[PDB]
């Protein structure tokens, strides 16, 4: 069920505090999990920077502070098999790879669509995927569960920061065990990410 | 890890799967004499 | 009607367990015979006893002796019981007829039949109709030596060939019967005496009909 | 992570647990035998 | 669930009494249930006479007395159908059949591998399989359950007996309704027998 | 009578703990004490490593911990004279002598038979036999006593160790005053060593 990141609920700062126009569920474009899929990551709050009332607040306020509640729903039949690791990585700095030593803006801030991994083994950051379980995470085993819920509080060296310039954390959905099925099953499995900001605070209104 | 029984599936089900092995220490794990790593 | 369907009553009544013959005319002039006590002499009695695995009972034996033409003269007879593991007579006048530890019954043909009750004789707590094991070859498999109840050596008390054959009908009544571990009734024909061996031509337990929907045979 | 921290120390002691996760289909039954051999003894050759 | 043979728990004799080196579960080689399978039987304690610490005790002790707990596990999908009768037969004397009136040692004591029935209709003993339900038994209906557990106490005319020479009981797994499936399903169904001796006693140590 | 090594009874560790199959007396092959005899030593638990149930435990367990009770019985008439020193030497490392600076395996672990001294003056270790009485010891003076009993607890820098690789202590029987008799007496005196392990513990069963 629900997992609390670092065992702390998100809370208010002891500034704009929207009640229900921001606290609503945001449902992102569904990702097609296929056999050859490497994985996807989103940057927060970059994923919601241009999406609904939260998008309007994050673009017209100097400072920002919010927790998040992520639901990763998966629509698969009992005849589909595979395991996703859903990991939240605080300060997920994406690395470039060169035989281009600096990643493009499209990779650092993929937006609401999200970016695919190129080297999910090293998480595109030079750190092993095998040790990614030190970060707050949930398994989605298609034979056990098709849901992951991670509650992430605000983590920063500063009490407030810019939504547009800084991403507090990244959320990665990575197929560890590849999706596999038999001829006749749907060739893809939908993966739905639902985000709900919790305890959102804003400053510098214009 | 030994195959106690054969892998059994119904029709239209993939006949090969994966096991993910995870590892950690218990509460009685200890470390001693700091040293620099090989990598 | 619960007394008639009890193990005590199912195994009650005296039944013929052997027709023993004491031949003393023609070529066979032995004048004696040794009959080993077999509770499973006949297939009817064997099938009823093999309903259980272990039994413990006392047996009562009756001897119905007469001549060829049903005549019962004043002839004397000795019905000696040889307990399990005692030597048996090897002749009409052997010393085994005088052994005191072999109980004898002296009775005439003119007297009513002799009766005597043999107790539970097994070294184990119950007779064992099925022994899944070896005493210590293929022949010895299933052969528990603890089921031997003894012998009944029968002779005419005479110094020479009488010239008269005596037919002895041994009747046994199982008494104080206790049975353990019920088993399916044997369905195949019995081929041999001490083995569950059956024919390769398996007989169906149920009689046949034309089809599964027709109540006609 | 335990195997990486162990390379920053000379000696270690204690118990380890190894979790196994099966990622086959929901309708995929069967049995595996997981056997542990203490350090003295050599690897088993057969399942029995 | 668990069935007690003859409604009596196995208990001690009012001698070696091992605690955990013998009481452990013994898991035998899995049997492949196929369409044409006739069935299997094991003799106890012949099945464990040459297997682990119980095997060492049964071969170097003159006398023996033990109860058993049998688990008959079956690994089948919902698309497999069939019914096994799992029957414990005390003093299961195997019969020969002749058109060879004495069974071979391989048939009387099959060992840990176990022996296949040749005439499961008569249980290789001339007794009908239809009446085998007077013995302690469990059904394994692939659509209902895939487990059978029979607890068998020590049954003998003697308080003690030789493990090597005498088999107290036989355990038969017989497919009544044959295994049937459609093309694509596993052509065999594993059948696993797990034995746990209970209240084992030994005498004559050398 | 009995002498306690270092004034401490052997005890359990605050693992296999056999009751009577190991605690039994083990009687070794008798040694013939003659006029020219130099002495004998045994390594513990190497002397019992391949002997009975203790031998089976010491070879199929990773770790080991046990105390010992040694009886050194001597069968001599009142017309035989001589004195044996029976000394227990903890960590008895045997030395080689060269005019071969490393002792053979036959000398370091003589087994149940035991090894004869070549230089009993230096105990085959370069240490004087005259000072061997700092170790736990008993005299056998043929005119006073023919028995020695030394109770030796577990002595080690580690709580547990390997029976097969490490010998906690050696037991030496050394004729100080040579055996002497007159013509007609038995030319040899039997020396019997009886060992009883006390508080034996084992780990790593296979």
DSSP string, chain A: -EEEGGG--------B--SSTTTS-EEPPPEEE-TT---EEEEETGGGTTSHHHHHHHHSEEEEEEEEEEEEEE---TT-EEEEEEEEEET-PPPP-----S--HHHH---SS-EE-S-TTTTTTTS-GGGGGGSSEEEEETTT-SEEEEEE----SSSSB-TTT--SEEEEEEEEEEEE--BTB-SSEEEEEEEEEEEEEEEEE-
Residues of D in contact with F59 (CB under 8 A): none
Contact A26, A48 (CB under 8 A): yes
Distance separating alpha carbons of residues F25 and C197, to the nearest angstrom: 53
Contact F168, F44 (CB under 8 A): yes
Q: Report the helix count and the strand count for chain B, using DSSP H and E.
A: 0, 3
Contact E170, E93 (CB under 8 A): no
> In which domain, by residue range, is C149 found?
1-217
Cited resolution, angstroms: 2.8
- Phi/psi class of residue F204: alpha, beta or left (left: φ > 0; alpha: ψ in -120 to 50)? left
N- to C-terminal Cα distance for chain B? 30
Beta bridge partner(s), residue E67? E198
Q: Which one, of E193, E203, E194, E200, lies nearest residue E67 by Cα?
A: E200
Cβ <8 Å between D31 and E190: yes
* F204 min Cα distance to partner chain D (Å): 6
Cβ <8 Å between E95 and C195: yes
User: Angle E106-E109-E112 (CA atoms, 0-180°, nearest 5)?
Assistant: 100
Asked: is F1-205 a CATH 2.60.120.20 domain? The reply is: yes
Cβ <8 Å between A81 and B17: yes
Cβ <8 Å between E75 and D31: yes
Nearest residue on chain B to D34, alpha-carbon basis = B1
Distance separating alpha carbons of residues A179 and B2, to the nearest angstrom: 25
Q: Which one, of A206, A119, A201, A123, lies nearest residue A160 by Cα?
A: A201
Residues of B in contact with A182 (CB under 8 A): 12-14
* Letter string b/e over residues A84-116, b meaning 16 or more CB atoms within 10 A of that residue's CB: bbbbbbbebebeeeeeeeebeeebbbbebebbe
How was this entry determined?
A: cryo-EM
SS3 assignment for E135-189 = CCEEEEECCCCCEEEEEECCCCCCCCECCCCECCEEEEEEEEEEEECCECECCCE
Distance separating alpha carbons of residues F20 and F194, to the nearest angstrom: 16
User: Angle F157-F159-F163 (CA atoms, 0-180°, nearest 5)?
Assistant: 90
Contact A112, A51 (CB under 8 A): yes
Contact E200, E54 (CB under 8 A): yes
Task: Give kind and range of the element (H or E) at residue C8.
Answer: helix C7-10
Rg (CA), chain F: 17
CA E121 to chain CA centroid, Å, is: 18
Task: Assess A206–D contact: CB distance below 8 Å, yes or no.
Answer: no
Distance separating alpha carbons of residues B11 and A167, to the nearest angstrom: 47
Q: Which one, of E95, E170, E179, E177, lies nearest residue E136 by Cα?
A: E170
Residue C6 CB contacts under 8 Å (≥ 6 apart), including other chains: none
Q: Which residue has the tokens 């999406």?
A: A51
Retrieve residue E153's tokens. Answer: 């106490």
Distance separating alpha carbons of residues C31 and C166, to the nearest angstrom: 9
Distance separating alpha carbons of residues C177 and F53, to the nearest angstrom: 48
Distance separating alpha carbons of residues F96 and F107, to the nearest angstrom: 9
* Letter string b/e over residues F80-92, b meaning 16 or more CB atoms within 10 A of that residue's CB: bebbbbbbbbbeb
* Letter string b/e over residues C165-189, b meaning 16 or more CB atoms within 10 A of that residue's CB: ebebebbbbbbebebbbebbebbbe
Contact C14, C174 (CB under 8 A): no
Residue E181 CB contacts under 8 Å (≥ 6 apart), including other chains: B11, E79, E80, E81, E187
CA F125 to chain CA centroid, Å, is: 16
* E88 min Cα distance to partner chain B (Å): 23
Burial grade of F128 (CB within 10 A; 0-12, 13-18, 19 or more):
exposed
Task: Give kind and range of the element (H or E) at residue C106.
Answer: strand C104-108
Distance separating alpha carbons of residues B17 and A82, to the nearest angstrom: 9
Nearest residue on chain B to A177, alpha-carbon basis = B18
Phi, psi of D6 (to 5 degrees): -60, -25
Cβ <8 Å between B22 and A180: no
Q: Which one, of E170, E191, E182, lies nearest residue E37 by Cα?
A: E191
Instruction: Indicate the DSSP class of residue C88.
Output: P
Cβ <8 Å between D29 and E192: no
Q: Which one, of E75, A128, E74, lies nearest residue D24 by Cα?
A: E75
Cβ <8 Å between B14 and A177: no
Residue D22 CB contacts under 8 Å (≥ 6 apart), including other chains: A141, A143, B17, B19, D28
Three-state DSSP class for residue E111: coil
Q: Which one, of A133, A180, A191, lies nearest residue D23 by Cα?
A: A180
Residue E46 CB contacts under 8 Å (≥ 6 apart), including other chains: E109, E110, E111, E163, E167
Distance separating alpha carbons of residues D7 and F186, to the nearest angstrom: 68
Burial grade of D35 (CB within 10 A; 0-12, 13-18, 19 or more):
exposed
- Report the 10 Å Cβ neighbour count for E102: 18
Residues of E in contact with C134 (CB under 8 A): 108, 165-166
Q: Which one, of C158, C152, C174, lies nearest residue C102 by Cα?
A: C152
Q: Which residue has the tokens 């799992």?
A: E86
Task: Tell me whether chains B and C touch (3+ CB pairs under 8 A).
Answer: no
Q: Which one, of C152, C176, C24, lies nearest residue C96 by Cα?
A: C152
Q: Which one, of A202, A204, A205, A167, lies nearest residue A12 by Cα?
A: A202
Retrieve residue E14's tokens. Answer: 């009012």
Cβ <8 Å between C196 and E128: no
Instruction: Indicate the DSSP class of residue C120.
Output: -
Contact F103, F95 (CB under 8 A): yes
Q: Report the helix count and the strand count for chain A, using DSSP H and E.
A: 2, 11
Residues of E in contact with D48 (CB under 8 A): 29, 51, 112
Contact E202, E119 (CB under 8 A): no
Instruction: Indicate the DSSP class of residue F136.
Output: S
Contact A185, A35 (CB under 8 A): no
Distance separating alpha carbons of residues A25 and A20, to the nearest angstrom: 10
* Letter string b/e over residues C75-106, b meaning 16 or more CB atoms within 10 A of that residue's CB: bebebbbbeeeeeebeebeeebbeeeebebbe
Domain segments of chain E as ranges = 1-205
Beta bridge partner(s), residue C175? C58
CA E155 to chain CA centroid, Å, is: 15
Distance separating alpha carbons of residues B28 and C23, to the nearest angstrom: 91
Q: Which one, of A125, A180, A147, lies nearest residue A3 by Cα?
A: A147
Residue C167, preceding peptide bond in cis (omega within 30° of 0)? no
Q: Which residue has the tokens 């069963």?
A: F205
Beta bridge partner(s), residue D33? B2
Distance separating alpha carbons of residues A46 and A26, to the nearest angstrom: 13
Sequential DSSP letters for F78-99: TT-EEEEEEEEEET-PPPP---
* E60 min Cα distance to partner chain B (Å): 30
- Report the 10 Å Cβ neighbour count for C197: 21
Task: Assess B18–A contact: CB distance below 8 Å, yes or no.
Answer: yes
**Which chains are within 8 Å of F by 3+ CB pairs?**
D
Task: Give kind and range of the element (H or E) at residue A56.
Answer: helix A52-59
Starting at the edge strand that comes first in sequence, how are the strands of the sheet with C32-36 ordered? Answer: C32-36, C151-156, C76-82, C104-108
D-E contacts at Cβ under 8 angstroms:
18
User: Using CB atoms, which residue from E99, E132, E168 is nearest to C200?
Assistant: E99
**Dihedral sign (CA C184, C188, C190, C196):** negative
User: Using CB atoms, which residue from B5, B19, B38 is nearest to D22?
Assistant: B19
Retrieve residue C106's tokens. Answer: 């002296």
Distance separating alpha carbons of residues A89 and A150, to the nearest angstrom: 12
Contact A169, A161 (CB under 8 A): no
- Report the 10 Å Cβ neighbour count for F118: 13
Task: Assess D2–B contact: CB distance below 8 Å, yes or no.
Answer: yes
Contact C78, C97 (CB under 8 A): yes
Say how many domains are in chain C: 1
Nearest residue on chain C to E109, alpha-carbon basis = C133
Residue A34 CB contacts under 8 Å (≥ 6 apart), including other chains: A179, A187, A188
* D40 min Cα distance to partner chain B (Å): 19
Sequential DSSP letters for C146-210: GG---EEEEEE--SS-----EEEEEEEEEEEEEEEEE-PPP-SPP-SSSS--EESSPPPSS---S
């Amino acid at each position: 069920n629900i997992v609390l990141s670092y065992g702390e609920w998100p809370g208010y700062c002891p500034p704009t505090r929207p009640d229900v126009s921001v606290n609503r569920f945001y449902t992102l474009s569904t990702k097609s999990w296929k056999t050859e899929s490497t994985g996807w990551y989103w940057k927060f709050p970059d994923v919601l920077n241009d999406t609904g009332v939260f998008g309007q607040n994050a673009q017209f306020h100097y400072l920002y502070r919010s927790g998040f509640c992520m639901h990763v729903q998966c629509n698969a039949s009992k005849f589909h098999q595979g395991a996703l690791l859903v990991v939240v990585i605080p300060e997920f700095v994406v690395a470039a790879s060169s035989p281009g030593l600096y990643p493009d803006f499209a990779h650092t801030n993929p937006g609401k669509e999200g970016q695919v991994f190129r080297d999910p083994y090293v998480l595109d950051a030079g750190i092993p995927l095998s040790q990614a379980l030190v970060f707050p995470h949930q398994w989605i085993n298609l034979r056990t569960n098709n849901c992951a819920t991670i509650i992430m509080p605000y983590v920063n060296a500063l009490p407030f920061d810019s939504a547009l310039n800084h991403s507090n954390f990244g959320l990665a959905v990575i197929p560890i065990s590849p999706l596999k099925y038999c001829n006749g099953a749907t060739t893809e499995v939908p993966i739905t990410l639902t985000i709900a900001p919790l305890n959102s605070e804003f400053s510098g209104l214009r | 890890i030994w195959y106690q029984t054969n892998f059994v599936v119904p029709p239209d089900t993939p006949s090969e799967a994966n096991i993910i092995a995870l590892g950690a220490a218990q509460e009685n794990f200890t470390l001693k004499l700091c040293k620099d790593t090989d990598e | 009607g619960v007394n008639e369907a009890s193990v005590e009553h199912f195994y009650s009544r005296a039944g013929l367990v052997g027709v023993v013959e004491v031949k003393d005319s023609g070529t066979s002039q032995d004048g004696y015979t040794v009959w080993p006590i077999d509770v499973m002499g006949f297939v009817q009695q064997r099938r009823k006893l093999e309903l259980s695995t272990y039994m413990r009972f006392d047996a009562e034996f009756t001897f119905v002796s007469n001549l060829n033409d049903s005549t019962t003269p004043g002839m004397l007879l000795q019905y000696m019981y040889v307990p399990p593991g005692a030597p048996k007579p090897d002749g009409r006048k052997s010393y085994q007829w005088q052994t005191a530890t072999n109980p004898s019954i002296f009775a005439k043909l003119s007297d009513p039949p002799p009766q005597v009750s043999v107790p539970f004789m097994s070294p184990a707590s119950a007779y064992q109709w099925f022994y899944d094991g070896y005493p210590t070859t293929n022949l010895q498999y299933g052969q528990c030596p603890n089921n031997m109840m003894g012998h009944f050596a029968i002779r005419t008390v005479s110094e020479s060939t009488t010239g008269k054959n005596v037919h002895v009908r041994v009747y046994m009544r199982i008494k104080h019967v206790r049975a353990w571990v019920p088993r399916p009734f044997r369905s195949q024909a019995y081929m041999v005496k001490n083995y569950p061996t059956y024919s390769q031509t398996i007989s169906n337990t149920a009689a046949d009909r034309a089809s599964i929907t027709t109540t006609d045979y | 992570m335990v195997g990486q921290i162990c390379r920053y120390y000379t000696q270690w002691s204690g118990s380890l647990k190894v979790t196994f996760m099966f990622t086959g289909s929901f309708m995929a039954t069967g049995k595996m035998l997981i056997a542990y051999t203490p350090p003295g003894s050599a690897q088993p050759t057969t399942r029995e």
